[PDB]
Design a protein around this ligand. Structure first.
Ligand SMILES: *[C@@H]1O[C@H](CO)[C@@H](O)[C@H](O)[C@H]1NC(C)=O
Ligand SMILES: *[C@@H]1O[C@H](CO)[C@@H](O)[C@H](O)[C@H]1NC(C)=O
Ligand SMILES: *[C@@H]1O[C@H](CO)[C@@H](O)[C@H](O)[C@H]1NC(C)=O
Lengths: 71, 501, 71, 501, 501, 71
């Protein structure tokens, strides 16, 4: 569990601000790269579960985000 | 100390009917108060310093395992229990292992195993709490007087000239009257006990560097921890690995140093300075009320300088719409005021821009006296005229921007301050209006609800949820729920982008 | 990213097999306890997104899983 | 060595007239082949050992930062460039800092800086690939002959009696013919080149421990890495933290040791032995074919003994349906058969249970000769009768379980073997056949598709996805997609539960 | 060692031609086997002893508490940890207490305390397991030969006459051929390993009284427990009471002796004899097969006694439908058979009742020879005639009851045996019929589910569920579920009433 | 938790066979006798919860048994 953005009105830099954008993305990126076959599974399951276009898109995004970060 | 040369600088205007101003002094930020017929002052908190830190809990990130012993048990019997389990500082684990007539056993099955090892911590990360009675802020007030480029940042010169002062703001002494000779005196009424919410942070020292971490995050670390002034460690099974069940000797090794895993976990923590059981923090905020009624303008009894001035260099923009320039006075007329002004053209000659250094004058009586002056020219082309007649010098200046762009930057900075301070941002620049109080109460309740709902999220979760809520609001049949979802999605997207990540 | 279950057909235990159950759940459970108020948000968003009970349940679960593990 | 005392033990009964059988020798597992008119043998691989490991990539988990230097530039002098950009082993980072007349500049703005620091690695995590021409499986073959409880697991005694032998299976010598004393000879046509896929694993050494990591997981590691036998470190910014940008000297510190963070990342890796540049693996599988043409039964010409036996100790259930006991002959007949059988009652005396130690006999001619005999009693109550007449000894034995429970356990173990071996599981206990080949091909294509779809998942994601697919299948209108979803969800749930986590 | 004088007695009429019969020797019971042309034998197991018991777990029911020490902590300072937080001989508890300036604290609130006490057990209840190789039943076989009142129950006299014998039935010797004087030999083939399910009980010793308790009940005792080899105690907080949280000294006292609560919890447990690490119990059953092919009559070459007999005392009804009387022979004819018969009238003199003492004779040659004879008169009025002519003595006897009431008592005892033994009850008096095996298989299949459904229920819950299921079946619509509920409720009500509670 | 009826096929008495009938009734009887007011509550709730006479009787009995033995 990472610390995350502090609440102490900091106009300066935190401990690791260089990785502040990629810290919550490197795992998902490296997982989807080596495991590209899931992108089709998530798309199919989202298309078959959503009755609307918005529902299908949200299902696909949620599945493609939950698979790398297993919980 | 002073606002000159700081990217974070705000300008508050003094109301003619108000005797005090309410401002939130943020760390690494500076506030400039400009009032009519009063000297300009710079109020800036330097740091928050709390001594006598009390140790709370020390996590271990580098353990040592030795004195291994294993005791086996026959299947269809009770569980195995090693004799070293009675001795303290020993971590034991139960497991199953294959037993039979080859292992000297009597039955075939999964026999019970019991392996113990001595747990010894090498380096630990101590977490300390901040007692709200030991905190003290260092606030610095600087009145814009006669300064040079060298002496502007020199605190010794400004203290000797009685134009600045660093003073401690404690809960037991929340008010301080800074005597500025011939400039009157300024009084600040600050709220030290409510400035930085020290009850929500721990002072964690990981090796040689110290951080300011959340309490909920610190109590969720899965590491061997011990209480204050205690050598008994708990949750010691994390830093130990039981390799494989063996009937005679199961191997137990300690994991590597978790010092790097801690540094990776302290991603958003704020690094602080810790020495002599005292933590120094240059971040945070401090709500103060600046009393400026007894603040009198110095140099109002001097005459205008009669000799010629010169620009010691090209005037420089500060990025905050102001211009700083250094003049040099040739004459020896003693203390004399400088006839410097910003005009729109060399034929109008009427003042159009405001001077930040109100009533500038040459302090010393010797020749070649350097004076630093800060002005605020209008947007567009203007001229910085010094003197009159044949000794008049002027410098053309172009100020890029407009009042509309300035208003956009101002409202963006206000939104960022509201996102960074919460309800405390309504007390910035306030003079006690009824609108500010209602706004602060509404922000208090709405922010309490908003934090209770969407607290603990990162900028990615906040951004995704805000986009989803906007998509749900634009596709909502009703009007009320649609506007609510739009507002929540907008504030979530703003909080996501405000991190700049 | 953690290594995960190997493919060598091992009948003994892996490196960290005692934590094989709570390996991917310590973060999510600890995040839920600290932030209970999100469970209401995820529930109402799933309810307003899904048109069927199955869609609502899946939306709620996917949101409640994707919030703690931000990736 | 032998199968006695092994928790993982499978029994394969070859059909009459069969001369060979395909096996999949798994690590820490033992297979027992029982053929009619042939002695019972125990085949198992002990360890796979590979030497001359070639290094591929070496990561760094403990770095050192030294030789700090910072080059600053004014807001209008462009970007700062430090003279350490041309020096390798120096990591440099460009940043911005607020400059002004106080810092020593002439203008006000975000001045560019370029801080460099020397990167030096102190401890590395070296990964090494496995050359397929250097692997060798150690296989042990043990034939069930006259043994005692003390000498059943003694490899030296079983080799002096020519009843067992350890041998290596190399890709250069994939066949070995073990010559037994009077049991004939047994030969194994193993396939060591296709046993363990060495092209998908690296041998990573993190400090004092060594692991068999995945090849793709090792390359995606976010740490400073250098190629084989090279000191050129790349991706060095991960172990270095650049602190708050300062004008004259920005501090750069190296993160803590990432050894513990690596041990945590190696959660599902397989620990292996590593010494003298060779690696030993007790886990894994080895597809092999045991040919038992020259395997003959010893002692078929001996005469049945006449004296009385006795039970030394109680028989013990091995845990796989078989029962092992030790007899003691009281005569001096010499080489003589043992009239031991498993009957349902003392009236019929019809053999109901088979013998694992087929054709048991007393080898030595001394007075008290201990013999270890392993039977396979029927379910329920039975008797182990040794001898006939007035010298026979009976031992009652109750075998708990049922034939239906045996079928359920066999189906569960077959499913677990299919999940752990994939298409190789069809080669287990295979004597050919059209069903086996088509089943293995269908499993090959289905497992290829299944891995390409749900390869890098944990048991939690697999379980949730299987539950979702089952819920979609029970609510599917079309029967085809319903059956497909039900099958895939069942496979996913089985793989999620098979890990027992 | 014989059946005379036992409330539990079974009579089995051997079919002519069959050489054996299956018995289920229940403890405190007795089986009388009568054949057409063979002497009558009594078979019963006297006890079941098992030596070399292994300790599995020892519970403490009387603990001692001393060395009280409390460590207090200020509010918002984390939970306190006492100095004696070590593993050995110390139990600790966390509590809160009011702190303030009066208690010597700095803040007001619920300060945390941690008090520890020295735990020491005084008397413990040791539980031991039974190794299935050390069990040995004591079966006694008695042959109805010439006995008297004083000699029928004397074991020394019956062994001197070679008419009775006590022998051990071990798993290593489940068969015993008891040799008799001139009655031949009786051979029993018992099943000691599956007689008493020793794998489901523990030998629990509470003080001086020892019990045979269930395994699952013994492991669910909420009491401080330790392992066998002098282990430390666990779950020790159940016998310790932390009275009231105090700032400086929280009092901790140990509860009273839990020996009474143990005896009250061992309600349905079975008391056993325990001494010298050996447990002996009289209850339980033992499935055995008695072979009587070599059992012959003694005294068939004798002639009928010529002199007259006399009734010593009155005949007595044993309560099992048989009648035992005493005769005193007045002659010195030596070994001569007794002409005794049970007739319906004194003018028919046709044998109507069956003699239990088959072929009675006067063994000794003295003047007055007492002899015990057992008969089975018909229901109603009958005469016991000894001799004929002038020497004839008659004794009227009335046998109450009828053949219908006898059948009712027989089916009641059969249902009770089925409820007490389960599937083992089908092997009582079984000669190997097809109906017996089918019935036993169906009973196994039904009883498995019945135990899985209503295993740990008392006679009250069983009776309530039986009544509820009968009510549901009566009010049911479908004829299948109605009869199912009827059958299940009837079985439950019978099991509830069978406890006689 | 008391031991309960053994499974050893015993024909003599157990440890405490004299209390075999009152061991599971002393608590409920004494509880019902010290507060008979609950008997009205159980009867009313069973009458207002069951639609048939059998359902009312079973509800009444189950409540009147659950109240004394709180577990
Ligand atoms: C301030 O000026 C004094 C001389 O008046 C000098 O000694 C001192 O070093 C200056 N301080 C700084 C920070 O430049
Ligand atoms: C094997 O047997 C030999 C000879 O009896 C003995 O010297 C040796 O110690 C035995 N080894 C083991 C492992 O039992
Ligand atoms: C059995 O008979 C012998 C010899 O008459 C006598 O000594 C012994 O006391 C008798 N035993 C019993 C139990 O009556």
């Amino acid at each position: 569990q990472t610390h995350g953005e502090s609440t102490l009105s900091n106009k300066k830099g935190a401990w690791m601000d260089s990785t502040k954008a990629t810290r919550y993305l490197v795992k998902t990126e490296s997982w989807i790269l080596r495991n590209p076959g899931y992108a089709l599974v998530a798309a199919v399951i989202g298309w078959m579960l959503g009755s609307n276009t918005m529902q299908r898109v949200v299902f696909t995004v949620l599945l493609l985000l939950v698979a790398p970060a297993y919980s | 100390f002073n606002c000159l040369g700081m990217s974070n600088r705000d300008f508050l205007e003094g109301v003619s009917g108000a005797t005090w101003v309410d401002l939130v002094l943020e760390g690494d930020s500076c506030v400039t108060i400009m009032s009519k017929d009063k000297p300009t002052i710079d109020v800036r908190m330097m740091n928050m310093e709390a001594a006598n830190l009390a140790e709370v809990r020390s996590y271990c990130y580098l353990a040592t395992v030795s004195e291994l012993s294993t005791k086996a048990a026959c299947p269809t019997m009770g569980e195995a229990h090693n004799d070293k389990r009675a001795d303290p500082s020993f971590v034991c684990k139960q497991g199953v292992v294959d037993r039979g007539w080859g292992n000297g056993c009597g039955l075939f099955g999964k026999g019970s195993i019991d392996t113990c090892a001595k747990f010894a911590c090498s380096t630990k990360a101590t977490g300390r709490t901040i007692l709200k009675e030991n905190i003290k802020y260092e606030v610095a007030i600087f009145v814009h007087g006669p300064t040079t480029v060298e002496s502007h940042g020199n605190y010794s010169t400004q203290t000797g000239a009685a134009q600045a002062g660093r003073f401690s703001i404690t809960p037991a002494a929340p008010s301080y009257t800074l005597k500025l000779g011939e400039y009157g005196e300024v009084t600040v009424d600050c709220e030290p006990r409510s400035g930085i919410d020290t009850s929500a942070y721990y002072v964690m020292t990981v090796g040689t560097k110290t951080f300011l971490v959340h309490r909920e995050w610190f109590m969720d670390l899965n590491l061997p921890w011990s209480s204050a002034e205690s050598n008994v460690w708990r949750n010691r099974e994390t830093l130990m690995e039981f390799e494989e069940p063996h009937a005679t000797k199961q191997s137990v090794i300690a994991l590597g140093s978790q010092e790097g895993a801690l540094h990776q976990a302290l991603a958003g923590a704020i690094p602080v300075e810790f020495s002599s059981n005292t933590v120094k923090l240059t971040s945070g905020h401090l709500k103060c009320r600046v009393k400026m009624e007894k603040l009198q303008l110095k140099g109002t009894t001097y005459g205008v300088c009669s000799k010629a001035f010169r620009f010691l260099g090209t005037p420089a923009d500060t990025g905050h719409g102001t211009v700083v320039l250094e003049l040099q006075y040739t004459g020896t007329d003693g203390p004399c005021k400088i006839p410097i002004s910003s005009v729109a053209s060399l034929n109008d000659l009427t003042p159009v821009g405001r001077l930040v250094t109100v009533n500038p004058f040459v302090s010393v009586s010797t020749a070649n006296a350097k004076v630093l002056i800060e002005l605020e020219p209008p947007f567009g082309d203007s001229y910085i005229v010094v003197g009159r007649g044949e000794q008049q010098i002027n410098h053309h200046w172009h100020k890029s921007g407009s009042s509309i762009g300035k208003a956009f930057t101002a409202t963006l900075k206000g939104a960022q301050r509201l996102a960074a301070l919460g309800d405390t941002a309504w007390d910035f620049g306030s003079v006690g209006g009824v609108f500010t109080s209602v706004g602060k109460a509404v922000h208090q309740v709405f922010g309490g609800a908003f934090r209770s709902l969407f607290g603990g999220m990162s900028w990615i979760t906040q951004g995704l949820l805000g986009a989803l809520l906007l998509w749900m609001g634009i596709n909502a049949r009703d009007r009320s729920i649609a506007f609510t979802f739009l507002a929540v999605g907008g504030v979530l997207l703003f909080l996501s982008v405000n991190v700049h990540a």
